[PDB]
Design a protein around this ligand. Structure first.
Ligand SMILES: Nc1ncnc2c1ncn2[C@@H]1O[C@H](COP(=O)(O)OP(=O)(O)OP(=O)(O)O)[C@@H](O)[C@H]1O
Ligand SMILES: [Mg+2]
Lengths: 191, 334, 186, 65
């Protein structure tokens, strides 16, 4: 894709439109969460903290999910850095995208009216081949991740761990209103 | 007789706080300047040349004040020149011989006195190299033969026969804020290297204090001009303590200037010691040197100065620490 | 991916390199390892005394490539602090543990995995060639366990047990094990 | 900006009708539409320096209105 160039008035500085929005403390997570796309989010979050530790960071999420470890690098960076990270769901926030949406600062988690939010237990975090001993190890690691994600989700949503265990058993699709009632987001934007 | 260099510094002390080495360098050169001028000029006597001074220092460190303070007791013609108005001979602007015209005017065109005078050239750092560099290197080149002894041909005291002035014995003091000079000194003193076999080296006042011609050449001065300024004197950057003394100790201290304005009314102005340090600290953070002290004092006094000429019965106004740190009114004593 | 530009105009990774932050993201390859080495060398000169921050989010990779980083970390004068983001597995865990003792960090929900090496290269050809490559792999296995045991202040026998099969650890377990020194929160 | 430094504070100008004019006692009000300064930021010298003015000129304009 061709990324448009925009001019900032200050003299003038030419930006690509995403660098221009980063100047406004807007970080986008678009598409699958990968090591590379997650590390760019982390780099942007770290950079924005240095620019101004007190101002909010706006983390716009339009993602079907992705790697758990990659999503956790974002998650821990969000919680670590001093400035509040506000999260906004555009289009969809599914799987780790929903996790990172719910991970925003409480009171500053938003969704657009027709966005779709989906929460579910993790799938393969990696293949389970090799010997039964290796398969046992990877099955145990996946269960620990499953419990960790449900526990952190339950914390984000102010719900019991038992509720998240039921609700993430199979793909649980929610409207913005249902996500608000559930506790994944705080507000729904209109204008 | 002549004053000793210590007397010159003693007089400079009433105006400039800190910069002990810059005051010393100026005092010794002026003392030697006097001695050279009473030296026999014929016979088996050795001819004496002169040592010119370059003042390197940060904004608001006192370079110009030193020159102006020095001038109060020089007893020789003295002129404040400005390098930003100089250009090459064939161009719009002032030629370098305009300096001599100004020095010469200060003594009512008595040439013998002009030839014994002292010239301060401000903004010397503004004619550095970094086509025909009309207002930069071209000026440095034009000055080479004015600083070293030449015969300047300047207009008469009337409207545009020209006067021949021998500049051999005119002392030149040049100076300016070589703002980009610290990076050069750090590049030279902390070169190091990258990669295994190579060895990597450890990483304003300290840097200027070790300035060498190599830095001034890389900065943008030409070797031919640097060698004509044999004495490099440096001014440090004022710290929090120096900026407190500058509020109350000088003959024209900042606080004394405002006490005089309040004294044109019948109100005494007093600052607490906590305010003086708070002012000095805030001013230091502005990175304008001593000048930042004026912004703070104008700021904290703005509303009391507004009311003062209308208020009746006020006898004393006290600027406490709170009035500098917080948007507080000064205490009014009626 | 489009790498944002931040204000001279830097890409955001060159901007973070200016702060002495070196990223190892994804698999360890000759090319990704040599960039880390180039950055480590460059930073040593910019300032031999200041710490270098080596952020690791890697599933593993080549041993020889990881060893080029490892030897560069140990060689250069400035301490290399290591931080685990997301995961540090295989050679990623090795390089994490290789950070300066007292300056090895992990984020709270990071995952650290240590294991014996897999194929360092295929074992085809004749039984004589297979013997040679099997011997080289065993020497590497012992070298990695020995260096791990040194990093962790543990016995070689402990690392030999624990790296037999993929050993996944939370940040707390990695701290107790000796792979990291601290866990960051804020 | 550099040329103005020595005009704002005291200098003796050579002024054609030459007339020697001491600018020491002239009050200067300097200003402008520093729109980029609201973006940089209660103006402080730090903001003016980032805007693009030289500290030597900022220090000669002590009062900001
Ligand atoms: N060392 C000092 N002692 C006393 N007053 C000082 C000192 N340094 C600066 N000042 C004060 O700062 C004001 C201006 O100083 P000065 O004219 O020397 O700056 P400058 O050398 O012209 O700076 P620049 O090189 O940027 O033009 C004066 O009011 C002066 O009293
Ligand atoms: Mg000056």
């Amino acid at each position: 894709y061709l990324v448009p160039t925009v001019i900032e008035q200050s003299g003038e500085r030419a930006f690509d439109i995403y660098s221009r929005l980063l100047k406004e403390r807007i970080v986008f997570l678009v598409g699958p969460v990968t090591d590379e796309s997650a590390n760019l989010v982390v780099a942007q979050l770290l950079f924005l903290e240095s620019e101004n530790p007190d101002k909010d960071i706006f983390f716009y999420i339009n993602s079907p999910g992705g790697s758990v470890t990659a999503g956790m690098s974002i998650y821990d960076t969000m919680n670590f850095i001093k400035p509040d990270v506000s999260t906004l769901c555009l289009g969809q926030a599914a799987s780790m995208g929903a996790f990172l949406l719910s991970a925003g600062e409480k009171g500053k988690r938003f969704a657009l009216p027709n966005s779709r939010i989906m929460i579910h237990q993790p799938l393969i975090s990696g293949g389970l081949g090799g010997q039964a001993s290796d398969i046992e190890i990877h099955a145990r690691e996946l269960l620990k991740i499953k419990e960790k994600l449900n526990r952190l989700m339950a914390k984000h949503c102010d719900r019991d761990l038992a509720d998240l265990e039921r609700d993430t058993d199979r793909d649980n699709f929610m409207s913005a209103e249902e996500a608000k009632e559930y506790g994944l987001i705080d507000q729904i934007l209109e204008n | 007789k002549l004053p000793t260099p210590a007397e010159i510094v003693a007089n400079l002390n009433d105006h400039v706080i800190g910069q002990e080495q810059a005051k010393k360098a100026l005092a010794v050169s002026v003392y030697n300047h006097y001695k050279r001028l009473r030296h026999p000029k014929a016979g088996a006597n050795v001819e004496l040349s002169k040592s010119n001074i370059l003042l390197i220092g940060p904004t608001g460190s006192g370079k110009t004040l030193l020159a102006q303070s020095l001038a109060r007791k020089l007893d020789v013609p003295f002129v404040m020149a400005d390098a930003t108005t100089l250009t090459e001979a064939g161009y719009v602007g002032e030629d370098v011989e305009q300096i001599i015209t100004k020095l010469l005017g200060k003594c009512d065109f008595d040439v013998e006195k002009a030839q014994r005078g002292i010239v301060y050239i401000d903004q010397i750092d503004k004619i550095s190299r970094k086509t025909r560099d009309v207002s930069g290197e071209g000026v440095q080149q034009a000055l080479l033969k004015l600083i070293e002894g030449t015969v300047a041909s300047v207009p008469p005291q009337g409207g545009r026969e020209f006067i021949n002035v021998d500049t051999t014995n005119i002392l030149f003091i040049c100076g300016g804020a070589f703002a980009g000079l610290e990076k050069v000194i750090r590049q030279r003193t902390e070169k190091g290297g990258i990669g295994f076999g190579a060895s990597v080296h450890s990483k304003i006042t300290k840097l200027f204090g070790i300035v060498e011609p190599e830095d001034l050449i890389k900065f943008g001065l030409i070797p031919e001009l640097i060698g004509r300024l044999p004495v490099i004197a440096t001014l440090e950057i004022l710290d929090e303590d120096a900026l407190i003394n500058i509020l109350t100790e000088p003959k024209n201290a900042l606080v004394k200037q405002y006490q005089a304005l309040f004294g044109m009314e019948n109100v005494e102005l007093e600052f607490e010691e906590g305010a003086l340090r708070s002012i000095a600290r805030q001013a230091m953070e502005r990175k304008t040197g001593a000048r930042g002290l004026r912004s703070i004092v104008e700021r904290c006094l703005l509303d009391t100065m507004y009311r003062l000429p209308d208020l009746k019965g006020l006898k004393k106004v006290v600027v406490g620490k709170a009035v500098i740190e917080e948007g507080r009114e000064p205490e009014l004593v009626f």
